[PDB]
Amino acid sequence: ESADLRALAKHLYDSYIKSFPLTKAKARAILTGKTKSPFVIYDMNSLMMGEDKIEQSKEVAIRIFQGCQFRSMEAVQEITEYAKSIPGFVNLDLNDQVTLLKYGVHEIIYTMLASLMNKDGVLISEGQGFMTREFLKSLRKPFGDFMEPKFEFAVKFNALELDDSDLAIFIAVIILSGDRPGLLNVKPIEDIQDNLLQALELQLKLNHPESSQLFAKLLQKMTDLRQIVTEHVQLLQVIKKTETDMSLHPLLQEIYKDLY
């Protein structure tokens, strides 16, 4: 029923707002000067000014890649806490909850990252910096490309003009993907996802009534996100196998690993 499907959407939106302080709405207000201004990092010189202006220094490409990777592991906390807020999720087998999050989190980071991006760059530091796409592309191989697949995805994705209320539900659908390798009980995952898919269809109808077959464009984009996490995962093996000794885990992840 439409009452339920809307209350669910309203519930996910509120939890999203709770879990994720920097919203697409705010990010967009910052990117367009509706708001304060972020420090622009466009060259080595401004990177150095910038990182001063908001343990170890080692060559910049590594520091940048490392920051991205830390910010991503950092983000896992807010995403995990969001996923628990999804009706029926905390009632799945724990091994399945873990698997869903294991394969989902990068897809969600890239989705939310796009809220922070425009063809020219990306907001960092809770909106306090703006790093250009060409600056990132300027980094030496293999680092000069780690962000391009994200920018390429983001520009097409952002053309859809989704707003946080649609994203709250989109992200929930991706978490609950019953085809992750290694799942124990696929059925109750697909049940929940199909309520979620129906709340999403209704959402886009009301929210994007001049955009029929928009739901199908979004379904398309979940495929586009697998391609990106696979390129990213393969790039990471290559960096691990060619660039000795960078730390890619923030403190909390290191201690949770070690207490295990």
Which residues bind to a copy of itself, rule: CB under 8 A?
55, 73, 76-77, 80, 84, 90-94, 97-98, 101-102, 105, 247, 249, 251-260
Interface pick for ligand DIF out of 27, 122, 162, 228 (rule CB under 6 A): 122
* Three-state secondary structure call for residue 98: helix
**Closer residue to ligand DIF in complex, CB, 5/41:** 41
| Nearest distance, CB of residue 109 and ligand DIF, angstroms | 6
What six digits make up the tokens of 141?
Answer: 């191989």
Interaxial angle between packed helices 94-115 and 60-84, expressed in degrees from 0 to 180 and rounded to the nearest 10: 120
User: CA 27, CA 117: separation in Å to the nearest integer?
Assistant: 9
What end-to-end distance do the CA atoms of the chain give, in Å? 44
Which does residue 124 touch among a copy of itself, Ca ion, ligand DIF, none (CB within 5 to 8 A, set by kind)?
Answer: ligand DIF
* Three-state secondary structure call for residue 27: helix
User: CA 85, CA 101: separation in Å to the nearest integer?
Assistant: 13
72 annotated ligand-binding residue:
yes
**Closer residue to ligand DIF in complex, CB, 151/204:** 151
Strand partners, 193: none
Q: Is position 210 an interface residue for Ca ion (rule: CB under 5 A)?
A: no
65 annotated ligand-binding residue:
no
Interface pick for ligand DIF out of 67, 88, 142, 178 (rule CB under 6 A): 67
130 half-sphere exposure, CB direction, 13 A CA radius:
17
Alpha carbon 236 to its chain's center? 17
Q: Is position 52 an interface residue for Ca ion (rule: CB under 5 A)?
A: yes
Residues in contact with ligand DIF by CB under 6 A are 64, 67-68, 71-72, 75, 109, 113, 122, 124-126
Residues in contact with Ca ion by CB under 5 A are 52
